[PDB]
């Protein structure tokens, strides 16, 4: 979903860091998937508006017209209406990605930051985290001035909160996992109700195929014209996918119409994607003159195959997306490995060794790393699609 940058930018030291703290005992580990955060503002951004040209497709001649603006004069042949069972489809898929899927990603940022923040705390707020008060108990468990009474309290204590966070780290875990289940439930169906990405694919190229024969190659211009589209469709996808650091809430704009698709808003400003703009209002000038059936085809068959475009995009964004998630999974599955061990063995070899200092400075490093992904995450969110 993303062309890396042939150039090192000033955000690839942020997702350094992260690499470089993804070994600390107790931190977040590896939270990057590349150069980007594991939960990827630009990749879900730009996702997001190919499940907003799903949202919008057209699902009967009526809405087909006003879709891609044909004029009421213009007869549509029979074999258009293969279109609308597989456009019905996709935007049942589209709406059922909006549902199920998206607010799961939005959530699964959220909880890394939950996380990271409660065991970091606040200093500016004078506010301790979970893990300054750990260190205070190995505090109390080592302290000299300590009775049997207290230290057997301590050791209740920091037991109870360690018990919590390794909670948390399950539900959390448990969370990726859904995102991983509901991933291929899109991609593969339900084997209930649910028709998956892939068969949907499979149905767009069968139309594609049909459509393209029959009315696609009706005349030079008709080969043209949509080679045209096809040469544009391919520029905007690798102008959209160029790696960069979205400044802007993510919102969406159709200003290129159905030929091409939605766009992350941000990106019209791109001086690129205007001359894009410019060359598809040269197409659609075309097609205002010439014959009725090169307008209609054009336009109809012109937005089948940016279509197809997308749902190749869906498909594989979705693939790599599983493999990230299921990371993510892993890495809380680690977590909370790593926090029971903590309150076990390693509270015991503080007892017994009555030393405590390193694993206070562990835990200590262990929070700014969580800072720093906390960070990212409420980034996240907060840029993120409604």
């Known amino acids: ?50 499940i907003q040209t799903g949202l919008g497709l057209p699902v009967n001649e009526q809405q087909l017209r006003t879709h891609v603006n044909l004029s009421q004069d213009i007869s549509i042949p029979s074999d258009f209406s293969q279109l609308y069972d ?26 890394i930051a939950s996380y990271g923040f409660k065991v970091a705390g606040d200093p500016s707020i004078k506010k301790d985290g979970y893990f300054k008060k750990l260190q205070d108990e190995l505090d109390n468990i080592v302290d000299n001035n ?15 909160r360690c018990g919590i ?34 068969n949907i694919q499979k149905r767009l190229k069968e139309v594609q195929t049909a459509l393209n024969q029959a009315h696609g190659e009706s005349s030079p211009a008709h080969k ?30 159709f200003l290129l119409g159905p030929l091409l698709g939605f766009v992350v808003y941000e990106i019209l400003e791109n001086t690129a994607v205007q001359h894009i703009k ?55 599955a680690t ?8 309150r076990t063995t390693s509270l015991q070899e503080v007892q017994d060794s009555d030393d405590a200092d390193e694993i206070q400075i562990e835990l200590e490093d262990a929070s700014d790393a969580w800072l720093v992904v906390a960070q990212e995450a409420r980034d996240f969110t907060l840029n993120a699609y409604s």
């Open 224 to 253: 043209e014209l949509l080679e045209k589209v096809k040469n544009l469709k391919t520029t905007l996808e690798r102008t959209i996918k160029a790696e960069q650091d979205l400044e802007k809430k993510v919102e969406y704009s």
């Open 278 to 332: 410019n060359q598809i209002d040269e197409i659609k000038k075309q097609l205002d003159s010439a014959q009725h059936d090169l307008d209609r085809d054009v336009k109809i068959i012109g937005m089948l195959n940016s279509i197809n475009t997308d749902i190749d995009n869906l498909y594989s964004q979705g693939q790599e997306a599983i493999k990230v998630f299921q990371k993510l999974q892993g890495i809380w």
């Open 1 to 50: 979903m993303i062309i890396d940058s042939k150039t090192t930018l000033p955000r690839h030291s942020l997702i350094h860091t992260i690499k470089l703290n993804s070994n600390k005992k107790y931190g977040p580990g590896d939270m990057t998937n590349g150069n980007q955060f594991i939960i990827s503002k630009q990749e879900w951004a730009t996702i997001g508006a190919y």
């Open 335 to 342: 977590i909370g490995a790593q926090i029971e061990n903590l």
């Open 86 to 111: 597989v456009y019905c489809s996709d935007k049942t898929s589209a709406e059922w990605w909006n549902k199920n899927l998206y607010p799961l990603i939005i959530k699964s940022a959220n909880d």
């Open 165 to 198: 966070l390794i909670k948390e780290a399950k539900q959390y875990e448990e969370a990726a996992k859904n995102i991983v289940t509901s991933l291929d439930q899109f991609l593969h169906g339900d084997q209930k109700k649910l028709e998956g990405v892939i």
């Open 146 to 160: 300590s009775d049997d009474d207290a230290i057997a309290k301590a050791i209740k204590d920091f037991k109870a």
